[PDB]
Amino acid sequence: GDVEKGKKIFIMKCSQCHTVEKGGKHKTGPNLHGLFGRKTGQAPGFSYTAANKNKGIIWGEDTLMEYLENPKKYIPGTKMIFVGIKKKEERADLIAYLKKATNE
Ligand code: HEC
């Protein structure tokens, strides 16, 4: 994926509710630093739904590709109210961006 295009998607569609930087603040949604390789519902200090907490998958490319296409479908009960990203390449670019940004 194209990290620069993914950053732009992040800003447009996610940044209203999420930060990515280490030590970044929780907002409507959790800070996302350290997301990759982590169980659902584990950002310290954020109050998740039981659904988010109990989904019982590990975040990575494959699970993010599915989740971000249709959040409610993947995690019924979630309080992330977001329509999803329809286009595969946009999801790929966004996830490439997140893989970098949530690690650095
Ligand atoms: C507010 C209107 C949000 C928008 C826009 C996006 N997200 Fe979100 N996200 C939000 C909430 C309130 C939550 C917690 C949901 C719950 O049921 O507790 C989340 C959760 C996530 C997660 C899961 C995090 C985990 O630790 O398990 C991911 C990976 C996530 N959100 C990513 C994400 C992206 C990439 C977005 C734009 C495409 C996005 N979210 C939008 C609130 C909101």
Side-chain angles (χ1 to χ4, degrees), residues 39-60:
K39 299 179 193 223
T40 54
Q42 293 290 318
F46 186 84
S47 183
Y48 287 94
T49 59
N52 206 148
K53 275 181 53 178
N54 289 333
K55 177 68 185 187
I57 60 84
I58 302 287
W59 290 123

Side-chain angles (χ1 to χ4, degrees), residues 16-81:
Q16 182 174 31
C17 296
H18 292 279
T19 63
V20 298
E21 62 270 23
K22 195 183 209 296
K25 305 183 166 313
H26 298 316
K27 306 173 50 165
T28 299
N31 173 265
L32 307 172
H33 206 267
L35 187 66
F36 282 67
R38 196 163 68 203
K39 299 179 193 223
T40 54
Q42 293 290 318
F46 186 84
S47 183
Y48 287 94
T49 59
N52 206 148
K53 275 181 53 178
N54 289 333
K55 177 68 185 187
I57 60 84
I58 302 287
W59 290 123
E61 185 183 340
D62 185 272
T63 54
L64 286 167
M65 286 289 285
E66 181 169 356
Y67 176 60
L68 293 173
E69 190 182 26
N70 186 341
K72 181 172 184 193
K73 182 181 184 194
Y74 194 61
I75 306 189
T78 186
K79 68 183 171 178
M80 174 162 145
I81 307 304

